[PDB]
Subunit: 123 residues, 3 copies
């Protein structure tokens, strides 16, 4: 429960996230058309891989999530970090393609990656 | 069972799908060589992400799939939609890179995404 | 256990793998800068998809992994194949982008893909 509770919710978000944004980018791509080209391309793949390792990591301490400890918060903020980070980006075809923005997204993937990873594993 | 039954099968397909097609594209890429360049590149990533969110969504109502309701059919046709959709595409390096074809694939990802997602979640 | 044991470990590796390598490439990309451009781009996506289907396949005989038979070894060497394969590659922006190296990585994905896939499925 506590467990299912966690994963679905994060992912659902995550997947409302990645979902609007995917078809959406598709939809805008053709609609914009071009700068928006990479913009859209761009959203997909950073995010697609935000998710891609989200998926690795979440999905797994998922079904290996024994300890009672509260860790979902990061499942939760890493989402929270990464969304506003893309969203912050968020149209500049010029590099920078990054910023404090992703010092948030990636780097939280990193922190919440790092701890929780190690956590349900070594236990 | 009913459950395992579902996921493996869809994925197996899905993964026979994504699998021939991956090494295959590799194999053809070098063999064609060039137009086939993006063609192959092309197959991977639409499909790679067909799968990528397949994976998100399937995999999860997977292990959160309680209701008796018949929903696998779409696991099943969204595959059925997406394969023939790429396959329909399926060599034009000119945009369009889409069509009624993906009005099928993506959009079923969308429908079968949308309902089943919400379904085992809100329950 | 035996099961959890398996998946986490492979993935952890896999995910220490894909993880250093992702932020890392990011980090080097900006730092190199350019040839390193595709190099880094390059690492991500072969590997990102090494993982991408790893994820499909591992993750699933994962929770459908009944037989006692020893199959983790490949979870294990396919990792072992693929790492040293990228790593072998591993800076040439000239094609070849492949070699005996990936005759290892991909092709083990293939062998260990192929058998274990079929195995916990048909059972
Ligand atoms: C609950 C907390 C108690 C107190 C709350 C009070 C907090 C109030 C914060 C007030 C802030 C004051 C504003 C100064 C900021 C100026 C920033 C700036 O100049 O831009 C930098 C710019 C710099 O831009 P740039 O010029 O480098 O590039 C832009 C791109 N070009 C140039 C191509 C156009 O960086 C960004 O754009 C980042 C975007 C920030 C987006 C912020 C929106 C998200 C905020 C989330 C939190 C909000 C509440 C959610 C709560 C939900 C509740 C559960
Ligand atoms: C943008 C900036 C960068 C962002 C990148 C990523 C984010 C980086 C995160 C960094 C780590 C932050 C550290 C916080 C934790 C440190 C505190 C600590 O250790 O104290 C002990 C811990 C543990 O609790 P305790 O140990 O004090 O309690 C003792 C009770 N016994 C021993 C009997 C069990 O305290 C907490 O952290 C509690 C925090 C709870 C969070 C607040 C919400 C609780 C309510 C739940 C529902 C609320 C709705 C929210 C839903 C959100 C919807 C979107
Ligand atoms: C069981 C049902 C009862 C009745 C079955 C009877 C159904 C019989 C349907 C007969 C159809 C009549 C044909 C008219 C169609 C003409 C289409 C056309 O012109 O092409 C559009 C074209 C338009 O092309 P275009 O010109 O825009 O671009 C092509 C690309 N260039 C130009 C670069 C070369 O679009 C497509 O290519 C789509 C490809 C369609 C592929 C169809 C094969 C898959 C069909 C799956 C179902 C088959 C059975 C599976 C059953 C399994 C059983 C469990
Ligand atoms: C290319 C075009 C776009 C494609 C994109 C994606 C596809 C879009 C899908 C859109 C939705 C379609 C709606 C269909 C459902 C609506 C019907 C409905 O609501 O009625 C009630 C529902 C529910 O059943 P019921 O409620 O009528 O039964 C009552 C019994 N009690 C109450 C006691 C439990 O009926 C059905 O849908 C039954 C359909 C079953 C499907 C037919 C096959 C059954 C046999 C199984 C094995 C067959 C082998 C197949 C293997 C395939 C291999 C590849
Ligand atoms: C335990 C076993 C018992 C015996 C152990 C004894 C084994 C000892 C093997 C000794 C080998 C002798 C060396 C001859 C090889 C020459 C290769 C060559 O020329 O390069 C080809 C080259 C050809 O290069 P190229 O010229 O086509 O392209 C390079 C790119 N450019 C040109 C752009 C610069 O291919 C490679 O680079 C492949 C890289 C190989 C990397 C090997 C390191 C990994 C080895 C893993 C095993 C090690 C132990 C791990 C054990 C862990 C324990 C649990
Ligand atoms: C770079 C080159 C390409 C690489 C690409 C991918 C790799 C390709 C792999 C190809 C397949 C290789 C075939 C090997 C198996 C064939 C042998 C066989 O069938 O015999 C019967 C099998 C089965 O056992 P058995 O059937 O003989 O035992 C009988 C006992 N009863 C019947 C009662 C149950 O034997 C084995 O394979 C045992 C091998 C075990 C592996 C050795 C290690 C065991 C110790 C565990 C801990 C060690 C630490 C290691 C951790 C690693 C850390 C990173
Ligand atoms: N889908 C591609 C995305 C590659 C990409 O956008 N690369 C960015 C940096 S990654 C960027 C980022 N960062 O650099 O901080 C971090 C990040 N993350 O942490 O997730 C996401 C990034 N992004 O822009 O997508 C870049 O500078 N490309 C060179 C160019 O445009 O010429 C991949 O997987 O490799
Ligand atoms: N792997 C890349 C694929 C990007 C791509 O092929 N973009 C297509 C549209 S996506 C296309 C699609 N569509 O547009 O309808 C929908 C789709 N889907 O629903 O899955 C898949 C698409 N595709 O061609 O792969 C395009 O028009 N690119 C600009 C160009 O070639 O210059 C990514 O993840 O962003
Ligand atoms: N992320 C891209 C990666 C595409 C890519 O690097 N393509 C390589 C071949 S794939 C290569 C490979 N191989 O060809 O043997 C196999 C492999 N694998 O088995 O995983 C990985 C490869 N790689 O270089 O990433 C290529 O030759 N591109 C054309 C060009 O650079 O102009 C995708 O998913 O399509
Ligand atoms: C329960 C899991 C939620 C699944 C949503 C999948 C959306 C995919 C985003 C790409
Ligand atoms: C919900 C996530 C929204 C992501 C918006 C990303 C903005 C793109 C910036 C490039
Ligand atoms: C049981 C799951 C089936 C796994 C097949 C994986 C194939 C990967 C396709 C890329
Ligand atoms: C099994 C799926 C086959 C996919 C074929 C895709 C055709 C590519 C069109 C571009
Ligand atoms: C237990 C599973 C291990 C999760 C590590 C995820 C790292 C992601 C790599 C991209
Ligand atoms: C741990 C995996 C390390 C991968 C190194 C890949 C080298 C890139 C070659 C291109």
């Amino acid at each position: 429960n506590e467990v299912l509770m966690a994963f679905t919710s994060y992912a659902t978000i995550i997947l409302a996230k990645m979902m609007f944004l995917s078809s959406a980018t598709a939809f805008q791509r053709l609609t914009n058309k071009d700068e928006k080209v990479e913009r859209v391309r761009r959203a997909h793949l950073n995010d697609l891989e935000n998710i891609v390792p989200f998926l690795g990591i979440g999905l797994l301490y998922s079904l290996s999530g024994p300890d009672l400890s509260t860790a979902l918060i990061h499942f939760r903020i890493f989402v929270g970090a990464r969304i506003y980070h893309t969203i912050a980006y968020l149209t500049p075809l010029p590099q920078p393609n990054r910023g404090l923005a992703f010092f948030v997204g990636y780097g939280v993937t990193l922190s919440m990656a790092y701890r929780l990873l190690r956590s349900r594993l070594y236990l």
